[PDB]
A paper describes a structure:
Langya virus (LayV) was recently found in shrews and isolated from febrile patients in China, representing the first human-infecting HNV from shrew origin. HNV infections are facilitated by the attachment glycoprotein (G) and the fusion glycoprotein (F). Upon G-mediated receptor engagement, F is triggered and promotes membrane fusion and viral entry. LayV F and G are closely related to MojV F and G but distantly related to their NiV and HeV counterparts.
NiV, HeV, Ghanaian virus (GhV), and Cedar virus (CedV) utilize a subset of ephrin receptors to gain entry into host cells. We decided to investigate the portability of this disulfide bond to GhV F, which shares 55% and 47% amino acid sequence identity with NiV F and LayV F, respectively. To assist the design, we determined a cryoEM structure of prefusion GhV F at 2.9 Å resolution revealing a conserved overall architecture and suggesting that the equivalent S196C/A215C disulfide would be compatible. The I268F/Q287P and I268F/Q287P/S196C/A215C GhV F mutants mostly yielded aggregated and misfolded protein with a small fraction of postfusion trimers for I268F/Q287P and a small fraction of prefusion trimers for I268F/Q287P/S196C/A215C. Similar to LayV F, the GhV S196C/A215C F disulfide mutant led to enhanced expression of prefusion F, relative to wildtype GhV F, underscoring that this strategy is broadly generalizable to HNV F glycoproteins. We describe here the computational design of LayV G constructs, enabling high-yield recombinant production of the LayV G ectodomain tetramer, and show that a disulfide stapling HNV F trimers in the prefusion state is a broadly applicable F prefusion-stabilization, enabling future preclinical evaluation of vaccine candidates against LayV.
Residue numbers in the entry:
A (entry chain C), B (entry chain B), C (entry chain A): 123 to 200, 204 to 547
The structure:
């Protein structure tokens, strides 16, 4: 829908076209995270109680468990239709986000309560990572923080150091650990009943070592890194065991869906001449095109890759009528901002040819040494190999190809919009 | 003041009511932070000088000390009124923020200079945490970084490793430490004469272990975690000893005050029908109500909890007249934004009943299988148990209660405002 | 150009004047960063392969190398003019930012390929930091992560711990390392062909220890800390050796240039009386003045110091005509915002004298105890030592000097602009 040949006359140069992708329905796996380390390897020091640490955890876990228990009590299985019934009255107030998550919680807990049957086997581990066998032949991946520090730095020195020295080292390392998770699972976790908690925030519970988790889950996808960086991989707390201080976390792993007839087009903005002074247009850099319709896209929440835009949601936004008219060729409605700085692009390469403002900078033909000048009635000069094979702009020598489009481009005039301030 | 029954007709559904709280007058305690570690346990390696490290610290501490000394010199005790006199001429230019802090500095230094009498006892420590006894029977809590690393990882290996290996390990760990505090106490600290430096930034001087500090200060309050996350706990540098490279920090611990007749009301926004297309209103999610007056609140600087909003300041903001008229029932002045995405809430639960847009999604009665339809003249359909006990929205079964309010709600019509773009 | 005596009547009080500085042409040095550690000290444990780690690195390095190789192939040396010729056709689409960087890449690689001749000597190191001698007598600084951990924590325990315990410790520490650099050199690195990648992001490849790097480069400048915090020090990836898994990084070290006749003037904003209610003006806090012209400055991207503003670019922005008229004395065009909070400055010191709103707060003369009152027709009261030597504002005693300017200030009236909402 965008008329590029005319928009380039006001500094909007067609850039790279990318496919639009949004995540779809996830698969899921359950893991167990243990918050209290095994310190029996330090049992030569009888003054270690771990009592203060347990109390500190209660202040975090109980406030959370009280919410999970509410939704778990409110939902029951369903009859003309199959499904799960959630009690609107019991909740009183709920947004669609928590209603949907509440249903997911109900289903997830049907397995979390089976994992809990291993609570004694979960507590009885001393490795940073352990694999427990379920009665059904399934495998539970247990991730415990602190164990690496204890096993490598404290236990080996149990005879070398004094017991007061070891206790001190342990008390400090535990308070450091607590400070780290408090940030994620403390008061900042407004409502645990969600399916969109970033896995990179959850991973803070074991040092922020996201790679360790992904390797254990067994995610080997070639695009795994893109799913991770786009924040498409998330998890949910489904069960908390307060006595043994461990959590059951469900990890959701999305399937990326490419949207048909949908892509994101970027524009390269350079300055141009209007009346002797230098101006830059105020058109959004990224435009989302679907079927044939123009809309805005909030790229700040998406991952930009070599050939695609990966979003965890559809971030399309409404576009004004004046901007749509601008993009379709009515350049009289494209707003301008004055340039008061030196830090502005004055040239770009697109389609193998150069678009440049040769009044604000100097353009010379390498072959002859002659200056490539534009008049005061022109916005931008377009340079191709029918004009000069190699052009020197500033002190950069750029070779060019042929221009595909109108051959009267440099004799074409364009109207401009009004000056605005932001 | 807000008329909820009419606003719900345009997708503004009453949510959770929270109390408004702002911090009041703090109490205070003094701590000492030492920047240079005790490496005499490594005195078998004679090539350790710590000289380069000291020079690096000078580049941070002197620029700060030069400001503290200025205010300390400018303030003197006071006479019709008691108090402290600050010299406006000596300062030349000062904002109220620094004038107030300057007075606090004067008072704090009356104790910091008494702590400094222990400068030899402060330097003569080798533990990460030490408690020194003052002549008056008071206790000074000394927190030192690096000591944990040195005592646990370097000293125990003094005979096992070569002295060049140990020196290298120490030089690297010190440069890592320096890099961390440089971030907080370097050029980014524009002016040290303040009472609002976050305690979580100060804690970077000893690894970011905020829990260690709080445990030593003896803060056991049940709401301590909320005070910390709301950034209500702050500190001030009151004294710097350049020769022995340590700082005296005053920690301010606020008392939360609940504001009478003041609360924050949240609204849940869902889409609604206007003319066949789908729209969302542009009314702020959080409204601050005081006595009977409406105002805006900058929630981005406050902590949102289950039943309160905790702010370090009063973040009330002016509200326009058109928005006040909107909120009090004149829905013709409530601006609309078009929906161009699929990622929008189309239903919510409030008061035990469901508000939903049954044109954009499908609503069925579980009991009969019949569709619950709304006409093209309606914005939203409200569903209660006088209509259908269990309603299937999408594929989620929700049970409902009775609606408290007008029983003619679903036959009531509302005017809407104009379309706008943002 | 700013008329301060009249603007102070509406709460805009002249603050501190700072010089405007922007970075100029850099010098450069090359360093080598190795991604795979030397684990031959652990060769008693035969189950260490490092194979999985290598594959994980390939997923990061290859996507980057494919871009560097493209620009390296496109550029060739140049003939009426000397220089480097870049192929616009081969690239197809490029912004000025990448065209310029592409030229820098060409030149840098002329040395990177000479460093690569030491690829066997680079791999054959086991220290965290090593200095290799080039055939030309030059020195290559090789920085390797992981070596500190391995040499200090794993190797010394090779006989003490079981080999399965050591392998586990190594596998975990490597996955932690990978997670850290993935953040910087993964998908978030949209295009490696740039000269503006922050050195503090690059330093993440070796723990974020920026001080270690700077010490090795030999930067001893007194203003080094300001260059670092202002983000003026950057680097570029010039060469990647995939077989030996190391990168050659060029570090650019800028020369700060003070701009003639250019400075940034800050204004201190306090509230004032208009008609009995309290108001605050909506004029930008920082104004950039060049020669004699007023413009806006985006201070959010600059470092503010005691006497200067240090920017990596020129961040001047256009200023509206209504604001220029406001600043030059037409106070009728200076917009007002209502105060609905208690958290607002009501006084400030500038020029040794006090400007205060003595209707919203209480002002008393220390010497006599009498109240210093202003009428309802006045905005602000200015207090100097010709009125009262020491004034008590709130409970703060401030001494004053003489006012330099009109002696009829307190009998001068000012017009105000219209109320606005934001
Ligand atoms: C435990 O600590 C106490 C001091 O509080 C000490 O007297 C006791 O000997 C310690 N226990 C052991 C086994 O050392
Ligand atoms: C959930 O139900 C159990 C009884 O089965 C009860 O003990 C628990 O307190 C309830 N939790 C909540 C939040 O109501
Ligand atoms: C600690 O771990 C050890 C070794 O796995 C196990 O024998 C012991 O039962 C565990 N103890 C606790 C308290 O979990
Ligand atoms: C200009 O470039 C095109 C390829 O883009 C080529 O076919 C044509 O021959 C070239 N013309 C000249 C004069 O170099
Ligand atoms: C200190 O370092 C020097 C090398 O600079 C070395 O010759 C000397 O032996 C070292 N001192 C000791 C006690 O090893
Ligand atoms: C403060 O006064 C002392 C003398 O008591 C002087 O040595 C010091 O330099 C002064 N500091 C400042 C910032 O003026
Ligand atoms: C280092 O600490 C030790 C043990 O507390 C003490 O004996 C010594 O005086 C301290 N030395 C220095 C230089 O502070
Ligand atoms: C509807 O719910 C209310 C409680 O909110 C209950 O008192 C009433 O009997 C219910 N009516 C029906 C038909 O279920
Ligand atoms: C390497 O690991 C295997 C188990 O996978 C073990 O059987 C073998 O003994 C180990 N090698 C050595 C030298 O211990
Ligand atoms: C660059 O040229 C070399 C041949 O010299 C080729 O092997 C390599 O694949 C080319 N790289 C790119 C990106 O074209
Ligand atoms: C590892 O480092 C050692 C000691 O510098 C060196 O002898 C050896 O060749 C290195 N091995 C590898 C694989 O780089
Ligand atoms: C007021 O202060 C000035 C210096 O700013 C001084 O010269 C003058 O004598 C002072 N006047 C009185 C009455 O204190």
């Amino acid at each position: 829908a965008i008329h590029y040949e005319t928009l380039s006359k006001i500094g909007l140069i067609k850039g790279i076209t990318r496919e639009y992708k949004v995540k779809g329905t996830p698969s899921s796996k359950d893991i167990v995270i243990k918050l209290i380390p095994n310190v029996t390897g330090l049992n030569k020091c009888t003054n270690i109680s771990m009592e203060n640490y347990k109390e500190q955890l209660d202040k975090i876990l109980i406030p959370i468990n009280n919410i999970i228990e509410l939704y778990a009590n409110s939902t029951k299985s369903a009859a003309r239709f199959a499904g799960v019934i959630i009690a609107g009255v019991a909740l009183g107030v709920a947004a669609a986000a928590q209603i949907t998550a509440g249903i997911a919680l109900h289903e997830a807990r049907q397995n979390a309560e089976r994992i809990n049957l291993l609570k004694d086997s979960i507590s009885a581990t001393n490795n940073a990572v352990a694999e427990l066998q379920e009665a059904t032949g399934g495998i539970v991946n247990v991730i415990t923080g602190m164990q690496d520090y204890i096993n490598t730095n404290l236990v080996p020195q149990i005879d070398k150091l004094q017991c007061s020295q070891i206790k001190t080292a342990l008390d400090i390392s535990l308070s450091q650990y607590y400070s780290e998770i408090l940030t994620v699972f403390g008061p900042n976790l407004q409502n645990p009943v969600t399916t969109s908690m970033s896995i990179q925030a959850i991973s803070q519970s074991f040092g922020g070592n996201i790679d360790l988790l992904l390797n254990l889950l067994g995610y080997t996808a070639n695009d795994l890194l893109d799913l991770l960086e786009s924040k498409s991989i998330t998890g949910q707390i489904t069960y908390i065991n307060l006595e043994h201080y461990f959590m059951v976390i469900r990890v959701y792993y999305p399937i990326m869906t490419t949207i048909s007839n949908a892509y994101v087009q970027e524009l390269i903005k350079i300055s141009f001449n209007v009346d002797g002074s230098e101006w830059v247009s105020l058109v959004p850099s990224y435009i989302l095109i679907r079927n044939s319709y123009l809309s805005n896209i909030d790229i700040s929440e998406c991952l930009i890759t070599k050939n695609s835009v990966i979003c965890r949601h559809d971030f399309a936004m409404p576009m004004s009528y004046t901007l749509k008219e601008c993009l379709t060729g009515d350049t009289e409605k494209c707003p301008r901002e004055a340039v008061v700085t030196s830090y502005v692009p004055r040239f770009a390469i697109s389609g193998g040819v150069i678009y440049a403002n040769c009044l604000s900078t100097t353009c010379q033909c390498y072959q002859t040494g002659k200056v490539i000048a534009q008049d005061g009635s022109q916005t931008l000069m377009m340079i191709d190999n029918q004009t000069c094979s190699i052009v020197r702009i500033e002190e950069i020598l750029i070779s060019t190809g042929k221009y595909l489009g109108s051959q009267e481009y440099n004799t074409m005039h364009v109207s401009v919009g009004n000056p605005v301030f932001t």
